[PDB]
Structures are given as structure tokens and as C-alpha cells.
Homo-oligomer: A and B are copies of this chain.
């Protein structure tokens, strides 16, 4: 509140403050205004606008080493969830992908429970500008390699930390070597495959409210994410691997005659995935 007051006072233009107070002009707003905008709010004299613009230039550009522009302008960031309408084709296609990828697992519903299909409560698009910029920059880097192709896919992700993911993004620092391909972040083509990890590894102890892994009452959350796989390394046997193998950007576990029953995808960099859709559902 007092920052713009100091800024204007240093210029000797405090007599303009009664305008800035009425238009709710803060310093983060002032740093984005030129001659046109300043004339709109009532700064009529050219000299006053010139002084204000030169002060803004001296602050933002003259002291860029301090990044004053980033201590300002912080507001407006964050995650917005936009609810899809069941009558739209986007919701219907997401639900079709969710339902049609269910499969019979080797374990008798021990981790994910027993069901044939889902009841989808709502689907939301996740919008976060900083996370999206991180993802697109990494995608550009990966596609500069691998002959101008990002090998981008849309894959399911199940975790008890979905809320943290949709606000801070994917992070490989939360992965550990206990995984089947090591310390990477895992994704699957099958929604039922990801449903096993919603309550932790191996299903954990079930829902917090029933302690039941097949609880048909408590809600569940999955993510449907854009994953940049780049040049993927195909593997059929388990590895305790910390990073992608040399020359590759991801690992693909393939279902052979023995071992894996379904395809699996692993990325060792959090910036290579973006959680586009958040799906809330129950198992039938």
C-alpha cells in the first residue's frame, strides 16, 4: 500500500496521490502503464507522465539484478480449476478413455478393488501458467533433440498426493528407488492400472474413512496428464535406475510373456509432465 506512495514521493509528485488512491493504482499496476493509460486516469501534463515512466524504467530496468519485477506482479499466479460440462464432447471423450481402459489385473482387486467401471463425479481442467511454461520449455528442449518430435502422450496418474501435484507440479524429488524402474514418476495407459496407486503403493491401507481398499463409498482422484516421453528406452525387466539411460528421455516397461501385464511409462524429470485434467470418481 505504501510502496507507490514512496515511489511517487521520491519523484516529487505526491500531489497526484489522490488520483492513484481513487483508481486503486498500486506499484505493480503503475509499472505497466504508459502515456495512454496515465492520460486515461487523469494525468494530463506530459511532464508528469514522463517523470512517472522514467521512474518506472529506472526501477524495473536499472535494478534488474534485484528482480523488483518479480517481487511485484506475484499476484494472479496459482492454479484455477475449470469444471467441464458433462454435455460437452471434451468431458465425454475423457470419460470414454477412463472407462474403456479398465482391465482385469493379476491381483484380484487387492490394490484397486473389484469393479467393472466407474461413476465419474466431475472432471476439471487444471490451469497454472508457471507450470505450463515450465512444461512447454522442457518440451521444446526435448524436441530440439529427437528430431523435432516431442513424443507427447496423454496418460493416467494415480497418487495420494494429487492435491500437491496440481498446485506445485510434478517433482522427481518425491520419487524414491522403491519403484519397479527405480526413482521415476510413473504413468499408465490404463485407468485401472493407475487406480491401484490412489491410496499409496499396493493400495496402502485403503480409504482413510473405511480402511478399505475396495471402498465403494469414498471418492477417488486421478490425473490425466500430458507427458513428454521423447526418445523412450524399451525395457522388459525391472531396474533400480535413478535417471533415464544415456541418450533417452523416458523408460517404457512393456508387457512380455512374463513380468508386466500392462504397459508402463516412467519419466525421471518432473518438468516433463503437466496435470491437464483432474478426475473425481467412484468405483462400481
Contacts and interface: CB of A to CB of B under 8 A. Distances in A.
Interface string A137-158: 0000000111111011110000
Contacts of A226: 149
A104 interface: no
A276 B89 contact: no
Nearest to A150: B152
Contact of A147 (B144, B145, B149, B277): B277
A93 interface: yes
B145 A149 contact: no
A145 B276 contact: no
A148 B276 contact: yes
B148 A90 contact: yes
Contact of A145 (B89, B151, B152): B89
Contacts of A154: 147, 149, 151
Q: Which of A94, A148, A224 has the most CB of B within 10 A?
A: A148
Contacts of A212: none
Contact of A90 (B90, B147, B151, B231): B147
A149 B93 CA distance: 10
Interface string A150-188: 011110000000000000000000000000000000000
A28 interface: no
A97 interface: yes
Interface in A209-247: 224, 226, 231
What are the nearest 3 A-B pairs in CB distance?
A: A93-B147, A149-B154, A94-B147
15 contacts: A89-B144, A89-B145, A90-B147, A93-B145, A93-B231, A94-B147, A147-B154, A147-B224, A147-B277, A148-B276, A149-B152, A149-B154, A149-B226, A151-B154, A152-B152
Given A89-B145, A149-B152, 19 more contacts: A89-B144, A90-B147, A90-B148, A93-B145, A93-B146, A93-B147, A93-B231, A94-B147, A97-B147, A147-B154, A147-B224, A147-B277, A148-B276, A149-B153, A149-B154, A149-B226, A151-B153, A151-B154, A152-B152
